[PDB]
Amino acid sequence: HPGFALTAVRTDTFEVDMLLYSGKSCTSVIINNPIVTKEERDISTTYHV
Amino acid sequence: MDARAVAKRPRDPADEDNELVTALKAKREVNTISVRYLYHADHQALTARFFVPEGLVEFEAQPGALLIRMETGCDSPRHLYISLYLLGIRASNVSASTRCLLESVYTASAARAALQWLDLGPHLLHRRLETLGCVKTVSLGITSLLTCVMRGYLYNTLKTEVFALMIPKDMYLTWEETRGRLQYVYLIIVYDYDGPETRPGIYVLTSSIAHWQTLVDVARGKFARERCSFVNRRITRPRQIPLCTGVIQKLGWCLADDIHTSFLVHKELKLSVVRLDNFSVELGDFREFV
Amino acid sequence: AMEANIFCTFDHKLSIADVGKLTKLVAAVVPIPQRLHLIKHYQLGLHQFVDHTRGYVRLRGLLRNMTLTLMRRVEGNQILLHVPTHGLLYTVLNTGPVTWEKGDALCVLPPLFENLLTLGQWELVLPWIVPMPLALEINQRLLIMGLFSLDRSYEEVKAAVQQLQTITFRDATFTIPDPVIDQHLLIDMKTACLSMSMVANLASELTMTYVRKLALEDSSMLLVKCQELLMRLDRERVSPDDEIARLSALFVMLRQLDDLIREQVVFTVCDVSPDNKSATCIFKG
Amino acid sequence: RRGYTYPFGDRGKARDHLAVLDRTEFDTDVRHDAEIVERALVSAVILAKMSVRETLVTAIGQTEPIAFVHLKDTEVQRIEENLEGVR
Amino acid sequence: FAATHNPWASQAGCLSDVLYNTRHRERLGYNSKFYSPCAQYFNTEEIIA
Amino acid sequence: RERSAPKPQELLFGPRNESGPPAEQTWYADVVRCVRAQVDLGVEVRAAR
Amino acid sequence: VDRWIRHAAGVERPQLLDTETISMLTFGSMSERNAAATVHGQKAACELI
Hints:
The structure is cut from a larger assembly and holds three copies of chain A, one copy of chain B, one copy of chain C, one copy of chain D and one copy of chain F.
Chain A: E1 8-9, E2 35-39, E3 46-48
Antiparallel strand pairs in A: 2-3
Chain C: E1 6-9, H1 16-23, E2 29-32, E3 38-40, H2 56-65, E4 67-75, E5 78-82, E6 89-93, E7 105-109, E8 128-131, H3 132-147, H4 155-165, E9 166-169, E10 172-175, E11 180-181, E12 184-185, H5 187-214, H6 222-234, H7 240-256, H8 258-261, E13 267-272, E14 278-283
Parallel strand pairs in C: 1-3
Antiparallel strand pairs in C: 1-5, 2-4, 4-5, 6-14, 7-8, 7-13, 9-10, 11-12, 13-14
Chain D: H1 2-5, H2 11-22, H3 30-51, H4 73-86
Helix pairs in contact in D: 2-3
PDB class: virus
Keywords: tegument, portal, DNA packaging, intracellular transport, virus
Entry title: Human cytomegalovirus portal vertex, non-infectious enveloped particle (NIEP) configuration 1 (NC1)
């Protein structure tokens, strides 16, 4: 035994299934019609909604 | 191959139904998506998306910054993207006041590390920097996205507004009295071969001179001291092999009335800029002169 | 609405596997020697230019003369090719050995290396798509190892040539072909090297005479120290018509050398796929 | 200097032997010079052998002997006669 | 209610403080990618924030 | 002045590195002119290398 | 002493493209190699104070 001890610290990551409660009309969500924008590239054309 | 067929005027989107409209109308089907007008579907500018860490995003939330990609001798982050401002702290031209200002702003691991990677390598700057376009977006985060264009104007998604190009004043350079109806904007880097650390000077030029030969002759006439020092270091400190007293890169065309002097604010710090309110990008790689 | 494409015809009948193989390169850069609407498959690629006496230098000159054209679509009996107009962005395939990063300024190089579409008499040899810094590096390395041809007998020359031959560029290591074959140097390489040697040699002689006169005039004070420099190197060790002929010859040799001196940027990259074989880029000069 | 300029097969091996050769300078003590001169010479001979592709012994516990490289035998014979005279 | 149960860890500059505070670790040359359980307890600048 | 070149982490993190001397030096000089016997002694003068 | 301690602790010398790689490392990198097989999961890195 050397002249000094030591305290070790450790972390373990657990996997968990949560449950969430919410009250009726706790929030109101505001949305519009989805909107599409075009990125033009020759071989493949992409559209962002 | 007929009289009626050849006489036809070309087909244009505002009157011809968009492709998704064609498909849905032909099936007689509906989507929840509102898809009649496609945004970005009439843009002439060619854009790209870049990711950068938060430390380098200073002074970049303002559209109109000029963006640079620089080489690093490492492997996994090997290319970082830096702004012309961060390039200014190293510029041995810019005055002490502006230098201390943007040194006070650019205080993070990422930007400072960009500075050591610039100061470390034996290569000259122009053999380490590749130029990108001018930026117009900001999407914040620990790693942020920037949208950059290098061919054309610089404007909002609806083209509701045009974003200027912003130059820091101590880099702004002029060589002519009577302003031309059209002027090009060039980037110039020049090297001081005096002292142990060859001090690089950074310029953004504006001139009506389109031709390469007369432009380079005027530049060499105005940069006499650096050429003298190039020949001097050739003579006095041999078997070190300098090349280039400077390089010139072309990106832009603006009308003289569009350019104005302006201020720039960030974190209530006050930086002075020269602005080109309407501006278009056309990038060409460097050319070297001695 | 529509675009002006170029049609290409293959004469040798194509097995279904081979026309499938055609699709696998449906976005690569296929050079063409001329602008015309319907061309025969012999014209595609660089095989017609492959003369085994002439190497990399002549082929890069020709590639500067060539017209680059993206393969666009594949159908039976005829292939669609697309000539890229300036400024527009296009999708290209990475055929060369090296990977790409955003913002890379690309060039074209002659083939330096399974052969594509080995028809009975023909082979499809695409150019190398390379970033410009490696273009400078490889051109210089090949050029220098061209210089050492006359004294390859001594061991240290062989070791230096080996050191110049191996090239690394962003995690890619590959060996370029030696421009010396059977101790004989290909005529194009020999002419280029001789021209560079003569340019330097004749500059040495002419510059002293023509500087010492100009030094009298120079208010920009650099020509006097230029004369000082040329005298410094001088310390390290004639008819007028012949003199004007010598100047003319100096510029002739300089003109013959221009292919090694400057090359154009043809593509520059905007984004690259995780499928790294392909990337989008805009078309330069 | 010559080794740093010379085009070796791989930079690592020649660089290491040249580095142990580079920082070998003396120390104002008589006894230690006898060790360090030999210690420099062995590395120098390693480097010279690698330069001209003659072999070097990689056996553990064996050091490549201190000797010339590719001199003609008359020169080294007169060297050894001079060394006897120095004895 | 003792002053400290581990003098080598609680003091403002002791062994564990310089070893595990992210700031003192930045004064040294660490590698940021490695998680350290102590950093949660010791980064006193963030704790004060 | 007796400072070794900074280790990389010192330059990446923390308060700035600095340069020792200012670009301008402060000097005093004695000026003697012989053509008219005259000496200038109380001179404050600036010097730069 | 360094070699003796490294062989006692069992760790290899730092080999790297020293300067630029070390600046990158101080910026952050994944240096620790994987184990060949891990029937038990992620390494519970213990820290000692």
